[PDB]
Structure formats: structure tokens, C-alpha cells
Design a protein around this ligand. Sequence first.
Ligand SMILES: *[C@@H](C)[C@H]1/C(=C/c2[nH]c(/C=C3N=C(/C=C4\NC(=O)C(CC)=C4C)C(C)=C\3CCC(=O)O)c(CCC(=O)O)c2C)NC(=O)[C@@H]1C
Ligand SMILES: *[C@@H](C)[C@H]1/C(=C/c2[nH]c(/C=C3N=C(/C=C4\NC(=O)C(CC)=C4C)C(C)=C\3CCC(=O)O)c(CCC(=O)O)c2C)NC(=O)[C@@H]1C
Ligand SMILES: *[C@@H](C)[C@H]1/C(=C/c2[nH]c(/C=C3N=C(/C=C4\NC(=O)C(CC)=C4C)C(C)=C\3CCC(=O)O)c(CCC(=O)O)c2C)NC(=O)[C@@H]1C
Ligand SMILES: *[C@H](C)[C@H]1/C(=C/c2[nH]c(/C=C3N=C(/C=C4\NC(=O)C(CC)=C4C)C(C)=C\3CCC(=O)O)c(CCC(=O)O)c2C)NC(=O)[C@@H]1C
Ligand SMILES: *[C@H](C)[C@H]1/C(=C/c2[nH]c(/C=C3N=C(/C=C4\NC(=O)C(CC)=C4C)C(C)=C\3CCC(=O)O)c(CCC(=O)O)c2C)NC(=O)[C@@H]1C
Ligand SMILES: *[C@H](C)[C@H]1/C(=C/c2[nH]c(/C=C3N=C(/C=C4\NC(=O)C(CC)=C4C)C(C)=C\3CCC(=O)O)c(CCC(=O)O)c2C)NC(=O)[C@@H]1C
Ligand SMILES: *[C@H](C)[C@H]1/C(=C/c2[nH]c(/C=C3N=C(/C=C4\NC(=O)C(CC)=C4C)C(C)=C\3CCC(=O)O)c(CCC(=O)O)c2C)NC(=O)[C@@H]1C
Ligand SMILES: *[C@H](C)[C@H]1/C(=C/c2[nH]c(/C=C3N=C(/C=C4\NC(=O)C(CC)=C4C)C(C)=C\3CCC(=O)O)c(CCC(=O)O)c2C)NC(=O)[C@@H]1C
Ligand SMILES: *[C@H](C)[C@H]1/C(=C/c2[nH]c(/C=C3N=C(/C=C4\NC(=O)C(CC)=C4C)C(C)=C\3CCC(=O)O)c(CCC(=O)O)c2C)NC(=O)[C@@H]1C
Lengths: 162, 162, 162, 172, 172, 172
Amino acid sequence: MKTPITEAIAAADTQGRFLSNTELQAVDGRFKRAVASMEAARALTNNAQSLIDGAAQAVYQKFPYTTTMQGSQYASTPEGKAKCARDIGYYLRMITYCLVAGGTGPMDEYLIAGLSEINSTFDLSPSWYIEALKYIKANHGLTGQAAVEANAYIDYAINALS
Amino acid sequence: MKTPITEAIAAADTQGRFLSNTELQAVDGRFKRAVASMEAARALTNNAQSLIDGAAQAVYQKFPYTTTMQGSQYASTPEGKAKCARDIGYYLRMITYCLVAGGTGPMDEYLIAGLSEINSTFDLSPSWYIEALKYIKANHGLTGQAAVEANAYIDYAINALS
Amino acid sequence: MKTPITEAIAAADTQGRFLSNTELQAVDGRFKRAVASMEAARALTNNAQSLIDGAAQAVYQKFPYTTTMQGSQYASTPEGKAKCARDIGYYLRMITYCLVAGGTGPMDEYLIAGLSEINSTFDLSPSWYIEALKYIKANHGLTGQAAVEANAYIDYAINALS
Amino acid sequence: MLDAFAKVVAQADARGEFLTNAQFDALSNLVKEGNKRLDAVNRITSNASTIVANAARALFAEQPQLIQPGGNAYTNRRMAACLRDMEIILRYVTYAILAGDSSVLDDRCLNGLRETYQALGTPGSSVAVAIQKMKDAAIAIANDPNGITPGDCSALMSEIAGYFDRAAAAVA
Amino acid sequence: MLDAFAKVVAQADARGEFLTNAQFDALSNLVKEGNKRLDAVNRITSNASTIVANAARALFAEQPQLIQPGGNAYTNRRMAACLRDMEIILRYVTYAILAGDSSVLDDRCLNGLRETYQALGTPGSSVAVAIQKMKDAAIAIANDPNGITPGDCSALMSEIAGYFDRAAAAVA
Amino acid sequence: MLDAFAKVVAQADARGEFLTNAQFDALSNLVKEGNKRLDAVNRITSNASTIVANAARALFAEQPQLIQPGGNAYTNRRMAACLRDMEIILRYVTYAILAGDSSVLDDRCLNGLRETYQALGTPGSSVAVAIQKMKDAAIAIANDPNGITPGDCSALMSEIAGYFDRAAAAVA
Ligand SMILES: *[C@@H](C)[C@H]1/C(=C/c2[nH]c(/C=C3N=C(/C=C4\NC(=O)C(CC)=C4C)C(C)=C\3CCC(=O)O)c(CCC(=O)O)c2C)NC(=O)[C@@H]1C
Ligand SMILES: *[C@@H](C)[C@H]1/C(=C/c2[nH]c(/C=C3N=C(/C=C4\NC(=O)C(CC)=C4C)C(C)=C\3CCC(=O)O)c(CCC(=O)O)c2C)NC(=O)[C@@H]1C
Ligand SMILES: *[C@@H](C)[C@H]1/C(=C/c2[nH]c(/C=C3N=C(/C=C4\NC(=O)C(CC)=C4C)C(C)=C\3CCC(=O)O)c(CCC(=O)O)c2C)NC(=O)[C@@H]1C
Ligand SMILES: *[C@H](C)[C@H]1/C(=C/c2[nH]c(/C=C3N=C(/C=C4\NC(=O)C(CC)=C4C)C(C)=C\3CCC(=O)O)c(CCC(=O)O)c2C)NC(=O)[C@@H]1C
Ligand SMILES: *[C@H](C)[C@H]1/C(=C/c2[nH]c(/C=C3N=C(/C=C4\NC(=O)C(CC)=C4C)C(C)=C\3CCC(=O)O)c(CCC(=O)O)c2C)NC(=O)[C@@H]1C
Ligand SMILES: *[C@H](C)[C@H]1/C(=C/c2[nH]c(/C=C3N=C(/C=C4\NC(=O)C(CC)=C4C)C(C)=C\3CCC(=O)O)c(CCC(=O)O)c2C)NC(=O)[C@@H]1C
Ligand SMILES: *[C@H](C)[C@H]1/C(=C/c2[nH]c(/C=C3N=C(/C=C4\NC(=O)C(CC)=C4C)C(C)=C\3CCC(=O)O)c(CCC(=O)O)c2C)NC(=O)[C@@H]1C
Ligand SMILES: *[C@H](C)[C@H]1/C(=C/c2[nH]c(/C=C3N=C(/C=C4\NC(=O)C(CC)=C4C)C(C)=C\3CCC(=O)O)c(CCC(=O)O)c2C)NC(=O)[C@@H]1C
Ligand SMILES: *[C@H](C)[C@H]1/C(=C/c2[nH]c(/C=C3N=C(/C=C4\NC(=O)C(CC)=C4C)C(C)=C\3CCC(=O)O)c(CCC(=O)O)c2C)NC(=O)[C@@H]1C
């Protein structure tokens, strides 16, 4: 998995050499940012439901056709809304993993890779999830760096969906 | 083994893709030619002996030195003529396999590959077999496409021997 | 291992071909030189001690600091002189292997490869051994080709240490 | 690889004999039925994406454990890998249909597959279910009476089912 | 590979749940102790050559059979290879210290190592002794109170000893 | 690989000792016999094609099953492969003769050969017969008294027979 620490090690390992000073400086930089990133992840984790449930509706309110339009890939049926809420948690959970791991690695491995094929195959509209994300970016009531770091992974998630 | 059908598949397989329309058209083309090619193979198969035995002599009549010239690689001895008749059948059998399989693949795999080394090592004169082939090309009493297809593999066999 | 004979074979083997005349001529050349090289190795082997022990002192007499300077990599202690005499034998033994095998192969494989790392790691001064070698080059009382061949591997050993 | 004709040739060559009348009649029969074979390959090929997708939804709805966190199809990279496998199997199956012989399917695709999934932790019995789901989807699509000249195609559909079944038995 | 944070993330992902307070406290604790980890990596790394060398002399003096003609460390190319191995192990150990997880060490270095030495005739138990010799050299160097801000570092040194011990147990 | 001299050097190095008088006398003896060795390599090499061919005819006439349709030497590509193998073995044998040691033969050619033929269905016992046929052809050619300075060469021919026999025992 990609993290500032693992990249550093991969770089020295590919050259059969011991870690360098610059790489050590990079891990220190990662530790200094760990503070605000960690409290961001804790905050988000403590406001899962209000964010998840709040994100769910923010997408039915902008894509109401998904509310009753017959089709398994829709939130017309209760299970459809179950699947949907499940996916929302997945996204929120991933961004907290990024904040925890100091990078996108977690989200790249578990969610981004194969994302397009998955959405294409099961006919899921990327915009649905993007609305979810825009709702979380403006709801997590985070400020300072904590908010700064979170929004970073949020936007990053938006890109990959576009 | 090489056949119009297998080549088509190899082409799509090397590109990890499903079969294309052109490839499908190629197999159809192969099926349309299958008719005359198959009856050619049946005809030849029904006139094995008369062709084989007739081919044998057509080469003793042009290379009589092989009739008594001492040397295991010669038809001087009865076993030498046995070996020789055996080889003739091999050739006839192969051309029918080509007509059956819609291509040279059968003859390339079982007879052409290593042909030169085999003739060099056991001291066999390519001309012997070529005379055999010229006798069959003018004896199989085939007409129309059936004859057309047969002669194709016959000439092809001549080339490889030259 | 590298020897005039093995190189010849490696050359033909890398080309999947039988040995050539030139390669055969090379082995003959090796056999002709074998005479003087072999008697050189026998001579040296018969005057091991006088050469080894004589080589040991020729280096304490030029590097007396190694006589009592505290440090395991020194001949200050008796075991230090043991190690040292051991190493001297190793060198003498190798040059005789070269004379026997008609080349440097023996010395390249068993002693030259990793030489620098070994001397660096255990803090051994290359000059110590080089003094040893200069003493043997001028002590083996060899003359003619026998001496010529020996000196060749001796100098060769000096290079690698420089 | 071999196709129907090549296999018969290989079987005859090993006996050093010319084809028998039963073999000639058999190969000639396949040719006469050629159009149907081409229609099945064309129809299954044109719907490949639909067959895989519908079969995937079917499998996961039937086996919800696979899509649970920590199951072999969780995460988008594993799901993408699973959908890909299903497409690989299907692709090689269409290959065997066009050839009238399962060699290409066996040699390029089924050989060693069982071991590969065992080493990854991927449940083979579950791959078989997906392969079976595609068989039914593919067959219904290939044997659909709409938009095609009516005729018997029951021999071909059995041949096609055989290949799928043969693929499922190589990983079950 | 994984680092301390990544492993916790992977353990949580497999359960499809967000980190618990105990996991957050644990990762935050590692961060607060960050400087010490960096000092240990930096100190062990800067002395790598000394640790290997001293450990080598120690091992061979303790096991004189290895340097006897015909033993696995005789000849300069085998000795060079042995010193190299010791450096490889050490290098990967420093890697695991910087990451706070032994995955890189296991995956790139320990996996299959036992078999590799058995196939070469190299005595694994002897490699372990060398690995143990380096542990003591490295730890004394990393936990030296001179030239560093006094503080508790006893948790880190146990973690570091674990990695070395874990490397020795993979070849003993 | 090793040659006669190299092997003796390797045996002495492993004991950390200089060559003994018996070893010196032995290597010097080989040198004195050098011309004969060169004549055997040169003679076997110049006739390589004849040895292989005659041995092939001999083997197949003795074992007609191999050239029957479906046997391992049927078809020109398999026969070409068989003649090629015989040439490969011979080539490596001449290699061992020139070196006075069977290492190159063992390491490049005999190692694993048994398994290779078993995996292909090629009968090892039959390869041995071919190898034995070449031994007799090669030896008669190398020890022929015509066109060469008369002398004892009986030690060399035994050494040469050993290599062939050793090659046949690796696949029988
Ligand atoms: C059985 C699977 C279904 C069925 C098949 C069926 N198809 C045909 C005839 C044709 N099929 C084609 C298709 C192709 N020809 C090609 O060269 C290619 C490659 C580009 C394709 C895809 C064609 C041209 C024909 C003939 C003309 C036509 O459309 O009629 C038949 C008739 C076969 C015959 O020749 O006698 C049949 C029976 N019919 C069914 O009911 C099954 C559901
Ligand atoms: C335990 C192993 C030993 C010990 C360690 C100890 N170190 C510190 C503090 C610092 N260490 C560094 C080192 C680095 N910072 C970096 O960014 C890099 C990469 C280039 C390195 C190598 C720094 C900068 C500090 C802080 C400033 C300082 O020197 O004091 C501490 C204090 C830790 C803290 O922040 O509270 C301790 C305890 N101390 C011991 O007694 C052990 C033998
Ligand atoms: C035993 C195998 C048969 C036999 C051999 C025999 N040969 C010689 C002598 C010579 N052989 C050569 C050949 C070469 N010299 C080379 O440098 C090369 C590489 C290009 C070859 C091929 C030569 C030059 C000689 C010496 C001159 C000569 O021809 O006499 C001997 C004599 C050996 C000796 O030096 O005392 C013998 C005995 N003799 C036999 O009867 C066996 C059938
Ligand atoms: C919610 C925003 C809307 C909605 C969602 C919906 N999603 C699915 C099915 C799937 N969703 C995923 C997504 C992921 N799987 C992962 O492992 C990860 C990373 C951890 C992600 C992001 C996948 C793979 C599927 C298919 C497999 C499955 O069903 O579990 C459905 C079901 C579609 C169907 O059954 O055919 C639905 C309904 N639908 C809406 O209308 C919301 C607006
Ligand atoms: C889907 C129905 C099920 C499933 C599949 C799944 N497969 C893999 C990984 C691999 N699959 C293959 C198979 C092939 N590769 C080929 O080239 C061919 C054609 C010859 C085949 C048949 C291979 C080689 C792999 C591993 C290498 C790779 O990932 O490409 C995975 C990934 C497992 C992992 O990441 O560890 C999965 C998930 N999984 C299911 O749950 C379904 C039952
Ligand atoms: C003698 C000239 C001086 C001297 C020598 C000394 N050498 C060592 C240690 C080693 N020497 C070697 C050398 C070789 N090993 C080989 O296998 C070969 C090729 C066959 C060679 C040339 C090696 C590997 C070592 C280290 C391993 C070991 O101790 O055996 C020492 C010991 C150093 C120590 O214990 O730390 C000494 C003292 N020292 C002198 O002062 C002489 C002038
Ligand atoms: C030293 C303490 C002991 C010792 C070591 C020794 N090792 C080898 C040979 C090999 N070691 C490895 C190990 C690795 N290679 C790697 O890339 C990695 C990182 C993933 C490791 C851990 C390998 C692959 C080899 C063989 C290939 C090679 O030589 O590079 C030898 C050589 C043995 C020989 O020449 O036959 C030796 C001597 N030997 C000892 O006596 C010590 C106990
Ligand atoms: C007949 C035209 C003349 C003739 C023939 C003759 N041939 C051989 C020996 C061999 N022929 C082959 C040829 C093939 N083997 C194959 O597998 C195939 C493809 C299916 C072919 C074409 C081979 C391999 C041999 C050698 C092995 C064997 O003997 O079976 C001989 C025997 C030579 C000998 O015993 O030394 C003869 C006599 N000879 C004539 O004079 C005719 C004009
Ligand atoms: C001849 C006397 C018998 C015989 C031989 C036969 N061999 C093969 C195939 C292979 N032989 C080898 C052997 C080597 N390859 C090498 O590079 C070396 C030198 C290190 C050796 C010794 C190999 C690797 C193969 C397989 C790969 C290939 O074909 O090149 C065949 C082919 C079998 C087949 O096509 O399936 C045959 C027929 N067969 C006999 O009946 C004789 C008893």
C-alpha cells in the first residue's frame, strides 16, 4: 500500500541502499501532518451516520428518479437504498483510511482500482457518489488543517469519478 | 495446427479480444471451400493403392539406379521398396489431411518440418518423391475445384522438397 | 573455473557447435606450456615453509607496527601471526594452483573475487600481502620458463591488490 | 490448438491411416451446419458484456458472502478481477465453439486454473456457479428464435453447454 | 508492503468498519514517539558497516569451522557473500523499523530464505547467530545515551529486537 | 565447469593443501598423453555426422516400434528432434574428452535429462541404446590404426567409453 513511509522505503529498496537523510526527512514531514489528519479521521468517524444518512438524501434530492425508477441499480427498492447507503459508508470509511495512512494508497487499492469497470458493469452513475462527496465536504464542519487534509482526499475521490 | 479457423482464433487471442466479423467471414470462406476440398480427399483416399503403387513405379522408371544399387537407402532390396511405398503413402495421406483441414498445417507439422535434415541424414533424393508427386498430380483424375485444391497442396509439397 | 581448455569449450558451447581446429590448437599450446608450469608448481610446493615463513618476516621487517600494535587485525598477538601465516600459505597455494591449471582461474575464483571487500571489512593492508609476494618473486630461485610462468601469476596477484 | 477437422486428422495420423467414411461424413456434416455455428459465435460474442454482467449480479445475489467486506469479491479491484475472469472464460468458450473442439479452451484457459484459484483463496465452486450462470444466458441468447431463419440447432446448443460445463468442472 | 498505519487500515477494511478509539490512540501514540524511531533508524543506518563487521568477527571467532578450508565461508567470494547477506538482512530490518511493521522484511527478505540456504548447504543456525550478533550491536548503538536527548526508548528497542529475532527464527 | 587439472585443484583447495606428488604425477601424465586426447576429439568431431546417422539407422532397425505411426520418432519433426538429441549428447561428450572431466557433460547436458524425457513420453531406455550405438561408432573411429602414429591409446578409449556409458545411465 502507498504511504509516504512505504514510498520512501520502496525508493531505497529499488537501489539496494539504506535509507537516506531526505527519505528520513520525508517521514518526519509525514509525522508532523499526522496530528491534524488523525483528528480529522476521528471527527469524521464520530459523525458517520449523520454524514452517511445526510449524504444519502442529498443525492435523492438531486436525482429523485433513482427514488422509484424500476431497476436493481436504483434506490427505488429498499434494498436499493441499502446498497446505496452501504456504498456511502464505503466512501466515508476510505477517506478516513487515507487521513489515517497519510495518503491516497488506501482509497486507490480498495476503491479506485476497477472503479470505472464496476460503475460501467453495474450501471451506477458516478454523479450519484460525487453529490455524496460534495455534501460531505460541506458538512464535516472541520476547520484548520484537519479540514484541509480531509477536503484533499475528498476532491481526489471526485477526480477519479470524473 | 494451422487451419484457417485456428489462425483466426490465434489472431484474436494474441489481442485478448473476442472474434471479429472479418475473422468470422474467413471461417465462412473456409466452409464454402470445404465442399470441393472434402470430395477431393475422399476421391484420393478411394484411389490410394492405384495412386501409391502407380507412384512407386513412376520413380523406378525415371531412377532405375534405385532398383538394384546396393545401399539401404535404396529400393534395390524388397524392404527398400517397402520403405519407399511406405513413404509414398505418407505423402498421399498428408495431402488428404490438408484438403480435410483446409490448409497446409497437417503437412507442415507432420512432414515438412525436419524434412531436409531427414533426407540429408538418411540420404534420400528429394527428386524421388517429387516424381511421385508429379505422377499423382497427373493421375488423380480430379476436375473442377476438387482438382484445383488438390494440385495446390501437391505443388506446395514440391516446393518444400526443392 | 577458467582454464585455456574450459574457455575453448565455453566458446564452442555458446555457439552450439563442435570444437574447432583453432580451439584444438589452443589446448595443444596449453599442453606445451604445462611442462615448465608444472615443475614450477612442484618446486614452489617443495619450498612452501621456507617461502611462507620467509615471506612472513619480510613483511614484519617492513611493517613492524604490525608487530605489537594492539588490534585483532594485527600480528601483534601470536594468533595474529597465525592468521597472517595462514593467509601467506593461501597466496602461495593459489599461485601453484594457477601454474597447475594453466591460468588465473583458480586464483580468481578462490581469492581475487571479494578480495577488496574482505580487506576493507577486516582492515587488512594490501601492501602487507604485496610485500609477501615481492619476496616470493625473488626467492623461488626459479629460472627459465618455470620462473617466467610463476612471476606471471605473482605480478597478476599484485595488480589485483593494487 | 486443434479445430474439429484438425483433431480428426491428428487421430488418423497417429494410426497412420486415411480418414474413414464415418469421419468424412462427420466432418462434412459439421460444414453443412456451419452457418448455425457462426450464428452462435456471433450472437454470444455481441452480447458478451450483457452475459457477464447479468451472470455477475445473479451470482452475488445468490452468494452475498462474496461481496461482504473480506470476501473474495469485495473491493473494486477484486470485483474488477472477477468480472474479468468471467469474461476470459467466456471469450475462450466462444473460441471453442468456432473451432468445434475444446483444445484452445483447455490449453490456454482451463489448464492449471484450479490450482491458481486455490493459491489465491478464490473459491472454485463459486467460479463454477458464475460459469453456469453464463451458460444459461449465452444459450438463451444463441438459441433465440427471433431475427433468425428457423431451423434445428439443438445439437450445437448441447455442444456449447458441454464446453461451459467442462469449464465449470475444471474449477469446481 | 505495509507500515504501522497501513496494517491497521487493512485490518479494519477487512471488517468493513472505521477505526476504533484504541486503534486511533495506538497510531497517535506511535506518531508522538516518532522522533525516537527516526533516531534508531538513523543510528543503525550510519553504523551499518561497523555492525556487520564486528558481528562477522564475532561469529567466526565463535565458529572457526566456517572459515576452515571447505567451510561455507572460506574463500573470499563466499566470505564476501556472507558479509553481503548480513548487510541485506540488516538493511531490511532498518526498513521494518522505519515502517513499524515487519511486512517488507518478511515479504522481500525472510520469505523462502530458509529453503535458499538449505539448497546451498549454508547452515541456517549459523546465519541466526550472525543475526543475533548484529541485534546486540545495533541495539547498543541505537540506545546509547550519548549525544541524544534523554528519554524512554525501551518500547522501541523491544520492537527492534523483535524484528531481528524474527529474522533469526526464519533461518534457524 | 572443470577440466582434469581444475578438478584436482578444487579437491586440494577444499583441504587447504598443496598438490601431492601422486596428483602432480597424474596431471603430468595426462599432459604427456595430450596428443592422443587431441586425436580422439578431432577424429570423433570430424565424423560426428556419420556417427549419429549410422547409430540412428541401427537403433530404428533394432527398434521398429519407434518409427511406427504414433511412436516417438514418427513424423519428420520428431525424427529431426531425435537426431538432434543424439548430436547434442555426442557434442557434449567430445567436450568432456577434451577436458578430461565429465563436469561440462553432467552440468550442461545430463542433469535433469531423465525427467525431461519422462515428461515428453520419450523412452529413456531407447535413448541409451542410441547413446551406446554412438559409443561403438565413435570408439572404432577414434582408435582406428590407419593414418596415425602407432601407440597405446587404450586408457583414453576406456575414459571415452566411460563418458558415453555415463550418459546412457543418466537416461536408462
Ligand atoms: C441456431 C443457432 C439458431 C438458428 C440458426 C440458423 N442460422 C441459419 C443461417 C444463416 N446464418 C448466417 C450467419 C452468418 N453467416 C456468416 O458468414 C457469418 C459471419 C459474418 C454469420 C454470422 C447466414 C448468412 C445464414 C444463411 C442465410 C440466412 O440468414 O438464412 C440457418 C439456416 C441454415 C441453413 O443454411 O440451412 C439456421 C437454422 N436457427 C434457429 O432457429 C436457432 C435459434
Ligand atoms: C531512544 C532511541 C534514544 C532517545 C531518543 C530521543 N530522541 C529524541 C528527539 C529527537 N530526535 C530527532 C531526530 C530526527 N528528527 C528527524 O526529523 C530526523 C530525520 C532527518 C531525525 C534523525 C529530533 C529532531 C528530536 C527532537 C529535538 C531533540 O534533539 O531533542 C527524544 C525526545 C523526543 C521528544 O520529542 O520528546 C528522545 C527521547 N533518547 C534516549 O535516551 C535513547 C537512548
Ligand atoms: C590413439 C587414440 C590412437 C593413436 C594416437 C597417437 N597420436 C599421436 C601423435 C600426434 N597426434 C597429433 C594430433 C594433433 N596435434 C594437435 O596439436 C592437434 C590439434 C590441431 C591434433 C589433432 C600430433 C601432432 C602428434 C605428433 C606427431 C605425429 O603425428 O606423430 C601419437 C604419438 C604420441 C606421442 O607424442 O608420443 C599416438 C600414439 N595412436 C594409435 O595407434 C591409436 C589408434
Ligand atoms: C447510492 C449512491 C446509489 C445506488 C447504489 C447501488 N450500488 C449497487 C452495487 C454496487 N456498488 C458497488 C460499489 C463498491 N463496491 C466496493 O467494494 C467498493 C469499494 C469498497 C465500492 C465503492 C459494487 C461493487 C456493486 C455491485 C455488487 C453489489 O451489488 O454489491 C447497487 C446494486 C445494483 C444491482 O443489484 O444490480 C445499487 C442500487 N443506487 C442508487 O439509486 C443510489 C443513488
Ligand atoms: C469471479 C466470478 C470470482 C473471483 C475472481 C478473482 N480472480 C482473481 C485473480 C486471478 N484470476 C486469474 C485467472 C486467469 N488469468 C488468466 O490470464 C486467464 C486466462 C488463461 C485466467 C483464467 C489470475 C491469473 C489471477 C491472479 C492474477 C491477477 O490478479 O490478475 C482475483 C484476485 C484475487 C486477489 O487480488 O488476490 C479474484 C477476486 N473472485 C470471486 O469471489 C468470484 C467467485
Ligand atoms: C598477514 C599478511 C598480516 C595479517 C593478517 C590477518 N588476516 C586476518 C583475517 C583474514 N584474512 C582473510 C584472507 C583470506 N581468506 C580467504 O579465504 C582467502 C583466499 C583463500 C584469503 C586471502 C580473511 C577472510 C580474514 C577474516 C576471517 C578470518 O579471521 O579468518 C586477520 C584477523 C583479523 C581479525 O581477527 O579481526 C589477521 C591478523 N595481520 C598482520 O599484521 C600481518 C602483516
Ligand atoms: C553469513 C553470515 C553466512 C553465509 C552466507 C552465504 N550466502 C550465500 C549465498 C546466497 N545468499 C542469498 C541471500 C539473499 N539474496 C538476496 O537477494 C536476499 C534479499 C531478498 C537474500 C537474503 C542468495 C540468493 C545466495 C545465492 C546466490 C548468490 O550467491 O548470490 C553464500 C554463497 C554460497 C555459494 O557460493 O555456494 C554464502 C557463503 N555463509 C556462511 O558460512 C555464514 C554462516
Ligand atoms: C521411395 C520414394 C524411395 C526410397 C525410400 C526410403 N526411405 C527410407 C527411410 C525413411 N523415410 C523417411 C520419411 C518420412 N518419415 C516420416 O515420418 C515422414 C512424414 C510422415 C516421412 C516423409 C524417414 C524418416 C526414414 C528413415 C527412418 C526409417 O527408416 O524409417 C529408406 C530407408 C533407408 C535406410 O534404412 O537406411 C528408403 C529405402 N528409397 C528408394 O530407392 C525409393 C526411390
Ligand atoms: C532419439 C535418439 C530419441 C528421441 C528424441 C526426442 N527428443 C525430443 C525433445 C527434446 N529433447 C530435449 C533434449 C535436450 N535439449 C537440450 O537443449 C539439451 C542439451 C542440454 C538436451 C539434451 C528437449 C529439451 C526436448 C523438448 C523440446 C524440444 O522439442 O526441443 C523429442 C520431441 C518430442 C515431442 O515433439 O513431443 C524427440 C522425439 N525420440 C525417440 O523416439 C528416440 C528414442
